[PDB]
């Protein structure tokens, strides 16, 4: 379906076999599939099968998952967001506490 | 959004303000909105606003709602289906018990 | 409706009247409908009505169902997958 470096899944809290939405920034296509884990550190985002009609190598995409919970909990819920640049390099931060000047 | 003769809502178990999927048999478009009640016996199926880009007067559509429940219950679940012909005439049946020959 | 051979439904754990997603590998179309059982051993995958605008005889498709469950359960969950080839010949592994 869509294979994703396990490190990226860890950061976003996305599970293997979880429903995901993929929003293609490059071409505007929007679709839903499920996540599979790619090897840790591979930095892979692979699209397979039917979904390959909706994204090409080099396209920039946002991959999201959604959960349900009662309203009371939802009021303070915080999503797990990972940001990327360049060749799927995950940005910190999480900055190191300043120990040098 | 989409207004529907209350008699039709009653038969299908669809509620005012419930999420509905509309599948357009005429043009193949598929979209999701919410139901509003039209006057009982009006036989109205009205599409409003943005949804009017997806259906025109005379198009044949299927309007569906979905519910969730645990697997054990789902194994025997029975949907509420109403069938139509002509000018939104709901078909029986429910046949009358034969009392005449 | 999407009528599906009951044997196939059993293998994938899909129920009659359950919501399903259909992803058309052939044409890239993606849609959602519900499953109805076809006769056991018929090997039928039938699209009707509006859905017939999205698939044709011969198209290769993936038919999926989704369930909800708490996080802990989700983390050890194993989907029920049936793999097909040929004349809708089903296998357990690919």
């Amino acid at each position: 379906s869509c294979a994703i470096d396990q490190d990226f899944l860890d950061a976003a809290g996305i599970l293997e076999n979880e429903a995901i939405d993929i929003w293609n920034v490059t071409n505007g296509k929007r679709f839903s599939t499920y996540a599979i884990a790619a090897e840790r550190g591979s930095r892979i985002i692979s699209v397979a099968g039917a979904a390959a009609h909706c994204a090409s190598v080099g396209d920039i995409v946002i991959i999201a998952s959604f959960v349900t919970m009662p309203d009371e909990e939802a009021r303070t819920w915080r999503p797990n967001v990972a940001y990327f640049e360049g060749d799927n390099e995950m940005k910190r931060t999480a900055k190191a506490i300043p120990v040098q000047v | 959004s989409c207004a529907i003769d209350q008699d039709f809502l009653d038969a299908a178990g669809i509620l005012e303000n419930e999420a509905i999927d509309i599948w357009n048999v005429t043009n193949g478009k598929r979209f999701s909105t919410y139901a509003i009640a039209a006057e009982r016996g009006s036989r109205i199926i009205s599409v409003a606003g943005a949804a009017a880009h997806c259906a025109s007067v005379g198009d044949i559509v299927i309007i569906a709602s979905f519910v969730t429940m645990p697997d054990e219950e789902a194994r025997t679940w029975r949907p509420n289906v109403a069938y139509f012909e002509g000018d939104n005439e709901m078909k029986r049946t429910a046949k009358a018990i034969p009392v005449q020959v | 409706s999407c009528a599906i051979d009951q044997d196939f439904l059993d293998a994938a754990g899909i129920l009659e009247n359950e919501a399903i997603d259909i992803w058309n590998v052939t044409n890239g179309k993606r849609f959602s409908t519900y499953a109805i059982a076809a006769e056991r051993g018929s090997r039928i995958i039938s699209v009707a009505g509006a859905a017939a605008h999205c698939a044709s005889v011969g198209d290769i498709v993936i038919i999926a169902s989704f369930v909800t469950m708490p996080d802990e359960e989700a983390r050890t969950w194993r989907p029920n997958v049936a793999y097909f080839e040929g004349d809708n010949e089903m296998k357990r592994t690919a």
């Binding site: 959604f66 | - | 994938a12 469950m69």
Partner: peptide, 26 residues
């Protein structure tokens, strides 16, 4: 919470469509 996930329950992978009818009222 508890926070509830949407997970792939199962799938039929690469089945072939055998019948397609706009007019089948079924």
């Amino acid at each position: 919470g508890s926070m509830i996930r949407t997970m792939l329950q199962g799938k039929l992978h690469r089945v072939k469509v055998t019948h397609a009818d706009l007019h089948y009222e079924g």
